Design an enzyme around this catalytic site. Structure first.
Site, PDB file in Angstrom:
ATOM      1  CE1 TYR A   1      -0.524   2.050   1.734  1.00  0.00           C
ATOM      2  CE2 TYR A   1      -2.744   2.884   1.356  1.00  0.00           C
ATOM      3  CZ  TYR A   1      -1.812   1.867   1.254  1.00  0.00           C
ATOM      4  OH  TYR A   1      -2.165   0.685   0.643  1.00  0.00           O
TER       5      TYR A   1
ATOM      6  CB  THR B   1      -6.039   1.395  -4.743  1.00  0.00           C
ATOM      7  OG1 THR B   1      -7.413   1.498  -5.132  1.00  0.00           O
ATOM      8  CG2 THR B   1      -5.180   2.256  -5.661  1.00  0.00           C
ATOM      9  CB  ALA B   2      -4.860  -1.425  -0.688  1.00  0.00           C
TER      10      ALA B   2
ATOM     11  CB  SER C   1      -7.051  -4.535  -3.368  1.00  0.00           C
ATOM     12  OG  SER C   1      -6.062  -4.876  -2.405  1.00  0.00           O
TER      13      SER C   1
ATOM     14  CE1 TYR D   1       1.197  -8.869  -3.826  1.00  0.00           C
ATOM     15  CE2 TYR D   1      -0.629  -8.085  -2.470  1.00  0.00           C
ATOM     16  CZ  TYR D   1       0.431  -7.826  -3.321  1.00  0.00           C
ATOM     17  OH  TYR D   1       0.690  -6.528  -3.696  1.00  0.00           O
TER      18      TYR D   1
ATOM     19  CB  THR E   1       0.404  -8.721  -7.155  1.00  0.00           C
ATOM     20  OG1 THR E   1      -0.830  -8.105  -7.543  1.00  0.00           O
ATOM     21  CG2 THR E   1       1.511  -7.684  -7.209  1.00  0.00           C
TER      22      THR E   1
ATOM     23  CE  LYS F   1      -1.428  -4.458 -10.086  1.00  0.00           C
ATOM     24  NZ  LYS F   1      -0.435  -4.055  -9.095  1.00  0.00           N
TER      25      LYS F   1
ATOM     26  CG  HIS G   1       3.332  -2.556  -6.359  1.00  0.00           C
ATOM     27  ND1 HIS G   1       2.886  -3.858  -6.291  1.00  0.00           N
ATOM     28  CD2 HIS G   1       2.765  -1.911  -5.304  1.00  0.00           C
ATOM     29  CE1 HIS G   1       2.087  -4.001  -5.244  1.00  0.00           C
ATOM     30  NE2 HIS G   1       2.002  -2.833  -4.631  1.00  0.00           N
TER      31      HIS G   1
ATOM     32  NE  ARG H   1       2.211   2.399  -3.225  1.00  0.00           N
ATOM     33  CZ  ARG H   1       1.521   3.079  -2.319  1.00  0.00           C
ATOM     34  NH1 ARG H   1       1.486   4.403  -2.389  1.00  0.00           N
ATOM     35  NH2 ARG H   1       0.913   2.450  -1.322  1.00  0.00           N
TER      36      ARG H   1
ATOM     37  N   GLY I   1       1.519   5.695 -13.892  1.00  0.00           N
ATOM     38  CA  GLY I   1       1.728   6.971 -14.555  1.00  0.00           C
ATOM     39  C   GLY I   1       0.654   7.439 -15.522  1.00  0.00           C
ATOM     40  CB  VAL I   2      -2.200   5.717 -17.174  1.00  0.00           C
ATOM     41  CG1 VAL I   2      -3.241   6.121 -18.209  1.00  0.00           C
ATOM     42  CG2 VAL I   2      -1.311   4.600 -17.693  1.00  0.00           C
ATOM     43  NE  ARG I   3      -1.554   9.623 -12.091  1.00  0.00           N
ATOM     44  CZ  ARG I   3      -1.136   8.365 -11.934  1.00  0.00           C
ATOM     45  NH1 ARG I   3      -1.400   7.432 -12.846  1.00  0.00           N
ATOM     46  NH2 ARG I   3      -0.435   8.040 -10.852  1.00  0.00           N
TER      47      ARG I   3
HETATM   48  C1  LIG Z   1      -2.352   3.288  -2.353  1.00  0.00           C
HETATM   49  C2  LIG Z   1      -2.045   2.188  -3.338  1.00  0.00           C
HETATM   50  C3  LIG Z   1      -2.390   0.900  -3.029  1.00  0.00           C
HETATM   51  C4  LIG Z   1      -2.024  -0.111  -3.860  1.00  0.00           C
HETATM   52  N1  LIG Z   1      -2.541  -1.338  -3.594  1.00  0.00           N
HETATM   53  C5  LIG Z   1      -2.239  -2.361  -4.453  1.00  0.00           C
HETATM   54  C6  LIG Z   1      -2.939  -3.590  -4.164  1.00  0.00           C
HETATM   55  O1  LIG Z   1      -3.765  -3.783  -3.273  1.00  0.00           O
HETATM   56  N2  LIG Z   1      -2.582  -4.667  -4.979  1.00  0.00           N
HETATM   57  C7  LIG Z   1      -1.674  -4.606  -6.037  1.00  0.00           C
HETATM   58  O2  LIG Z   1      -1.316  -5.564  -6.713  1.00  0.00           O
HETATM   59  N3  LIG Z   1      -1.165  -3.344  -6.286  1.00  0.00           N
HETATM   60  C8  LIG Z   1      -1.393  -2.182  -5.543  1.00  0.00           C
HETATM   61  N4  LIG Z   1      -0.957  -0.905  -5.867  1.00  0.00           N
HETATM   62  C9  LIG Z   1      -0.453  -0.639  -7.088  1.00  0.00           C
HETATM   63  C10 LIG Z   1      -1.328  -1.005  -8.292  1.00  0.00           C
HETATM   64  O3  LIG Z   1      -2.711  -0.963  -8.062  1.00  0.00           O
HETATM   65  C11 LIG Z   1      -1.054  -0.312  -9.571  1.00  0.00           C
HETATM   66  O4  LIG Z   1       0.100  -0.855 -10.157  1.00  0.00           O
HETATM   67  C12 LIG Z   1      -1.156   1.248  -9.598  1.00  0.00           C
HETATM   68  O5  LIG Z   1      -0.931   1.952  -8.414  1.00  0.00           O
HETATM   69  C13 LIG Z   1      -0.749   1.874 -10.969  1.00  0.00           C
HETATM   70  O6  LIG Z   1      -0.097   3.084 -10.996  1.00  0.00           O
HETATM   71  P1  LIG Z   1      -0.700   4.524 -10.796  1.00  0.00           P
HETATM   72  O7  LIG Z   1      -1.031   4.689  -9.376  1.00  0.00           O
HETATM   73  O8  LIG Z   1       0.471   5.300 -11.233  1.00  0.00           O
HETATM   74  O9  LIG Z   1      -1.849   4.593 -11.676  1.00  0.00           O
HETATM   75  C14 LIG Z   1      -1.289   0.137  -5.016  1.00  0.00           C
HETATM   76  C15 LIG Z   1      -0.960   1.432  -5.340  1.00  0.00           C
HETATM   77  C16 LIG Z   1      -1.340   2.457  -4.498  1.00  0.00           C
HETATM   78  C17 LIG Z   1      -0.925   3.884  -4.815  1.00  0.00           C
HETATM   79  C1  LIG Z   2       0.444  -9.265   1.067  1.00  0.00           C
HETATM   80  C2  LIG Z   2       1.193  -7.981   0.677  1.00  0.00           C
HETATM   81  C3  LIG Z   2       0.966  -6.807   1.644  1.00  0.00           C
HETATM   82  C4  LIG Z   2       0.715  -5.463   0.940  1.00  0.00           C
HETATM   83  C5  LIG Z   2      -0.639  -4.841   1.335  1.00  0.00           C
HETATM   84  C6  LIG Z   2      -0.548  -3.377   1.843  1.00  0.00           C
HETATM   85  C7  LIG Z   2       0.868  -2.777   1.926  1.00  0.00           C
HETATM   86  C8  LIG Z   2       1.304  -2.322   3.329  1.00  0.00           C
HETATM   87  C9  LIG Z   2       0.137  -1.769   4.174  1.00  0.00           C
HETATM   88  C10 LIG Z   2       0.498  -0.514   4.990  1.00  0.00           C
HETATM   89  C11 LIG Z   2       1.707  -0.697   5.920  1.00  0.00           C
HETATM   90  S1  LIG Z   2      -1.510  -2.336   0.716  1.00  0.00           S
HETATM   91  C12 LIG Z   2      -1.068  -2.842  -0.895  1.00  0.00           C
HETATM   92  N1  LIG Z   2      -1.418  -4.030  -1.480  1.00  0.00           N
HETATM   93  N2  LIG Z   2      -0.546  -4.265  -2.477  1.00  0.00           N
HETATM   94  N3  LIG Z   2       0.343  -3.261  -2.550  1.00  0.00           N
HETATM   95  C13 LIG Z   2       0.035  -2.340  -1.566  1.00  0.00           C
HETATM   96  C14 LIG Z   2       0.618  -0.928  -1.548  1.00  0.00           C
HETATM   97  O1  LIG Z   2       0.242  -0.184  -0.476  1.00  0.00           O
HETATM   98  O2  LIG Z   2       1.536  -0.577  -2.275  1.00  0.00           O
END
Ligand SMILES: Cc1cc2nc3c(=O)[nH]c(=O)nc-3n(C[C@@H](O)[C@H](O)[C@@H](O)COP(=O)(O)O)c2cc1C
Ligand SMILES: CCCCCC(CCCCC)Sc1[nH]nnc1C(=O)O
Ligand SMILES: Cc1cc2nc3c(=O)[nH]c(=O)nc-3n(C[C@@H](O)[C@H](O)[C@@H](O)COP(=O)(O)O)c2cc1C
Ligand SMILES: Cc1cc2nc3c(=O)[nH]c(=O)nc-3n(C[C@@H](O)[C@H](O)[C@@H](O)COP(=O)(O)O)c2cc1C
Ligand SMILES: Cc1cc2nc3c(=O)[nH]c(=O)nc-3n(C[C@@H](O)[C@H](O)[C@@H](O)COP(=O)(O)O)c2cc1C
Ligand SMILES: CCCCCC(CCCCC)Sc1[nH]nnc1C(=O)O
Ligand SMILES: CCCCCC(CCCCC)Sc1[nH]nnc1C(=O)O
Ligand SMILES: CCCCCC(CCCCC)Sc1[nH]nnc1C(=O)O
Lengths: 350, 350, 350, 350
Positions: B24, B78-79, B106, B129, B155, B221, B245, B248, B278-280
């Site tokens: 995930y 993240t989340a 988040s 959102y 976002t 975003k 994102h 993803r 990608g920032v690492r």
């Molecule tokens: C597990 C996961 C959860 C994410 N959840 C969110 C989120 O809750 N809200 C959002 O706008 N972006 C979400 N993103 C993406 C951003 O927080 C963000 O653009 C980021 O992952 C940046 O890239 P990096 O993982 O390469 O550093 C998620 C990414 C990951 C990997």
């Molecule tokens: C209202 C938008 C719903 C997105 C929230 C989640 C994504 C799906 C959760 C697991 C099936 S967690 C998340 N939040 N934003 N992006 C993510 C990500 O996982 O890439």
């Protein structure tokens, strides 16, 4: 079975040296992109050989800073060579003189300038960093002049050490019986203070300062932009050495072979421009010279060959390289260094 | 042995987290081309370092939206962080504050805005959102303002979820004891409705709507074209975050580092443009800033380090990155962020 | 575990079909460079998605030759489908009709036009080669018209068969109980004569000839240069299908996606230009359409899915593709096919 | 299972020949970059086939130096063919004549010109190097003329031997019973003197010298720059053979296919320009001719096939190549060599 190329020494060195020692000599900075690129870039330059030319006698002799040498392949200053072989700098010193070329000694050598000087006569350069204790710098310079060193190579690309991760994971330490001999004797264990003596406030005025305490030609090592090349010229540099420190400092800096031409043009023929980093074949040498370089320096090949066969290894590396370079000149239709031209080469960026 | 770079945390996280959880956090969209590209693109930008510059004191402080932070490295939202470590958002919250930087929370966090706020003082942003139930959005905003969150990061790149195939094959589900705490408490299990609450009719007028229910600066975003960047400016955006994102959503969108400059130019210096994805490495940070970015955000590194060493891991990730960034500035000859320039970099597309 | 993408069917097909059968469906010409390139080329085209657009309702319907279909994804004529599954063309026929799209039947089908027609109503095209025995061609056309086929797709890229080496090493032969049903019944084992019936003297006048024995729209399949595209227009072609025969003819012909734009421009909007070869993802579909294509055709995916799960497999392939295509339109900000534009895409050759 | 392409012979040859023999035939110079590139470069040229053209009869006949041959695929001079098969040059001689094409004999052949001539009638060329003992050269020429050889192919790219490292590690030596038959008989073991007889002072005046001792057309083999191509024309060359010696001399010289066009343009249609190196497919042949070459020569394929199946192998290689070339012409829409044009091809450098 027999050693047919410089690169094969790395494998032997690796198979015999302790991980810590091999990693210290072999590693680049962080993800080591530029390390790989230093070698790979040469593969992006092709030849345009001239056929049916009398290539009976090939002349590889050149005049560097007034000194006449056998070939345009010199030795770069490595460090703590005695970790590779008991004789360290000694073997390298004798091998350089016998090969008829120049050897640049590092301030961090496991042998002193005078120790090296005793091996026999030869044209030698001294590499140095302007330390915080300017008095220690003065002493080092004076000490080099007495030993008969012909020039000072000032390295300007290490205001702070790069992150060579392997060393961090290994917890690198200088083996028990070795010593930074040049620091032994004059007015100041040795690994920690000398490392802590790095002065990061250095600027062009400090270059001038060096010029007021020595009359030896100053070579700036670590210039890779046309902007700095011009400044090096303005500030009385005797020559510029395009170098990225063997890719051990800032990763993602271009391959020296790619940056070279920009530096050559900036210099406007006012002073010699040299290069190091990635040189492992005579074909590499021909390309660097066809691009404007007055000569090249080799680093790692020395320590690897040293670990494998001591002095014989170093002599072997120098012979292989001159042989390869000669055959390249022969097949390209160049009887002397002066005959090598930009038209004998073709870069991927042309 | 020792952790020397951010990327090494992914391996540990992988070796300890359940396949479902790791996948995930780690997966990209479909064939994951942009995932790979987000990292690989940085390798196509090279440095043009300036030597012999007084780099004694390096200043990495910057002012984002009036707030002064220690470095231009912030945490992305993240989340469900508690899937990585019992403390989840708590550890990340304390680590961010201690590091002296901003943390974006988040809406899908396994901790509530007020839960995070109690850890201690710190500048925080809230990601959200515009859901179908606008009333729920109003409540979330009001709730964030009370907790003292400084800005809202809207976002706009998820009108519909991307296809992360690993999740489908795994049949991803939120573990038993975790809860989307921000949705617990106000007027509306939680995983299915909130996912079903996504409003795909959102357009620029809804951005205006958000602006009539909150006075907090709104950050868009998910902008990656110059066309949208201009619209974001016209519609009162406080800043733009170039993001794909974390690759993803829609695969085959360019790497954020490649798209960045187009967005920066479109903004015409009217509002700050940030970047994530990608920032690492500190070298990554220097390139993003040299290209115009006011700062960057990191995602995955947080959850991976969190899984490996909880808060210590997150603190370790933030320290490593600032250290690497500092050393990069030092070696490039930049004493402050203002000193970083486009001329200190060289892109493959130049 | 679950099938999440079209490409995964190839693996299952491979693991269950006899080497001879799999190789026949999977192989390309000689060194199979274009085979690999047909897929890889799509990776060189990137998206430029528009955010914040009402993407509540996505319309994928289109009108091909007056006929209205559910999506711009049609089925290409393969051959001897019964080698993949007992039902062969039957399963594919029912699946196409149910999906609401067009299916092109091959003259070398293991089921006859009338056999296919009985499955149920649906818009179908007939693929054919002008054989030496023009009388056999007339009969085939007349027979297709009776079965209610809407158009004739003339393949012009096989004057002689390409060298698919795997077939040669395998000594490919049609299994015992299968038969080229369209050749069974009218005035002329079947594998050798029909193969020997290929007329290699065909030229543009023969295209005219076909037009004097049928009133059905003629689609030229196998055009990849702008020169031929213009001729196809001049000679009354109803539409052009940019195709390289799934890379089974002349190796080193460009990927259809790369050649497409040249053909689209040559056509000058006078007739529809379609494409096939390498299409496996909805993202692939969006790019082909953004480049000018009116729709696309898929080949191998049909036979692989057929081998794995018969009709269900084919239905699964068609559903996955439309789903992926929809989500791509949604994320790009396109509510109808008419909304897709060249500006929504970015080619490596731009 | 069955041999379907020329390249497959290399594997068989390898699996049956002694390491020393295989390595001698298979190796390139030093790091063997150009070896790999000679093959890879062809992959960077694509087709632009013309469809719907009467390709009933394909004519591959051509006139080289007044002589009419079956196809534009000739055999290059290899060396010591008897190491590959007891019959060596004999098998190759009969195979060439039967195939209706030209065979170039090497001066270092394990069979003499007259030995080859006895096999039967056929158009043959003699390859030679102007040795120090000009008298030996005169004798060789006179001896070739008596045997009825039609032309002399002067190789100008070996003033000194390249470094094929495998040979050095293997300590290559000519097996006991083999002999350089052309040197046996006239006024001068044989491996060391003939190797030591290489004259590296050769220049354009020596080309003139050859022209005063023979009236046979002189073909210069080893020209890869436009500068030398013009000189070859000025100095009465009957034709130029663009060659990099199968990448065994100077590594990092471009692939012959890439250099070809430059040489063709320099020649200005005054004399035929041929090519060798990397040719293994009929598609390779079509590209070389579309680029201006009057014909091509093959080297390694001969010795590999010879080792595997003696004469039958060589006949098989020649048949496969003509078949592949024919099918390529057919699919491109070319009925004769005169019909092949630059517009039928598309280079990555266009
Ligand atoms: C597990 C996961 C959860 C994410 N959840 C969110 C989120 O809750 N809200 C959002 O706008 N972006 C979400 N993103 C993406 C951003 O927080 C963000 O653009 C980021 O992952 C940046 O890239 P990096 O993982 O390469 O550093 C998620 C990414 C990951 C990997
Ligand atoms: C209202 C938008 C719903 C997105 C929230 C989640 C994504 C799906 C959760 C697991 C099936 S967690 C998340 N939040 N934003 N992006 C993510 C990500 O996982 O890439
Ligand atoms: C183990 C090692 C030690 C080095 N020590 C020094 C040194 O003492 N002084 C210096 O200016 N450069 C040092 N360098 C780098 C230079 O000598 C030089 O640029 C060189 O390594 C050239 O590249 P090459 O190793 O690719 O040939 C060192 C490099 C290595 C690998
Ligand atoms: C096994 C197989 C059989 C084929 N049979 C035909 C055929 O009967 N008629 C025709 O014009 N093309 C034939 N083709 C090619 C086309 O149907 C078509 O261009 C297609 O394969 C598109 O590419 P894809 O397989 O990459 O989707 C065949 C392709 C395959 C793989
Ligand atoms: C084993 C071997 C021997 C060769 N001997 C000769 C030779 O006697 N004379 C010559 O001019 N070239 C010689 N060449 C090279 C040419 O015949 C020729 O350029 C050829 O190898 C073409 O490339 P290919 O091997 O890729 O087909 C030799 C090449 C090989 C591999
Ligand atoms: C005053 C500057 C200090 C650098 C001297 C050493 C580097 C670190 C020694 C091992 C930790 S050895 C060395 N000298 N110069 N570069 C190096 C190198 O190893 O790359
Ligand atoms: C009148 C032309 C003859 C081609 C028909 C078949 C090709 C060869 C059958 C197996 C040897 S099946 C087929 N039909 N069209 N293309 C193919 C393909 O297999 O690529
Ligand atoms: C008068 C020139 C001497 C070259 C003749 C041979 C090369 C070396 C023989 C084995 C050591 S055989 C040969 N002839 N020409 N090229 C080659 C080749 O092997 O590449």
């Amino acid at each position: 079975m027999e050693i047919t190329n410089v690169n094969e020494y790395e494998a032997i060195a690796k198979q015999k040296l302790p991980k810590m020692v091999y990693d210290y000599y072999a590693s680049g900075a962080e993800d080591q992109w530029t390390l790989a690129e230093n070698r790979n870039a040469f593969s992006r330059i092709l030849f345009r050989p001239r056929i049916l030319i009398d290539v009976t006698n090939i002349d590889m002799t050149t005049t560097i800073l007034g000194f006449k040498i056998s070939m345009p392949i010199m030795i770069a200053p490595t460090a703590m060579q005695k970790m590779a072989h008991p004789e360290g700098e000694y073997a390298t010193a004798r091998a350089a003189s016998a090969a008829g070329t120049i050897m640049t000694l590092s301030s961090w050598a496991t042998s002193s300038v005078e120790e090296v000087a005793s091996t026999g006569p030869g044209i030698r350069f001294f590499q140095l960093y302007v330390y915080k204790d300017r008095n220690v710098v003065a002493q080092l310079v004076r000490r080099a002049e007495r030993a008969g060193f012909k020039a000072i190579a000032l390295t300007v690309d290490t205001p702070r050490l790069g992150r060579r991760e392997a060393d961090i994971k290994n917890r690198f330490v200088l083996p028990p019986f070795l010593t930074l001999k040049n620091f032994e004797g004059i007015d100041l264990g040795l690994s920690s203070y000398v490392a802590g003596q790095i002065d990061r406030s250095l600027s062009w005025k400090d270059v001038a300062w060096l010029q007021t305490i020595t009359s030896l030609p100053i070579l700036v090592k670590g210039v890779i932009t046309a902007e700095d090349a011009r400044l090096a010229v303005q500030h009385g540099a005797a020559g510029i050495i395009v170098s990225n420190h063997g890719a051990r400092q800032l990763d993602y800096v271009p391959a020296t072979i790619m940056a070279l031409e920009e530096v050559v043009k900036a210099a406007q023929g006012r002073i010699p421009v040299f290069l190091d980093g990635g040189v492992r074949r005579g074909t590499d040498v021909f390309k660097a010279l066809a691009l404007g370089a007055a000569g090249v320096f080799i680093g790692r090949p020395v320590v690897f060959s040293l670990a494998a066969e001591g002095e014989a290894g170093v002599k072997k590396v120098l012979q292989m390289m001159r042989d390869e370079f000669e055959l390249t000149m022969a097949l390209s239709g160049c009887r002397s260094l002066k005959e090598i031209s930009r038209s004998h080469i073709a870069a991927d960026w042309d």
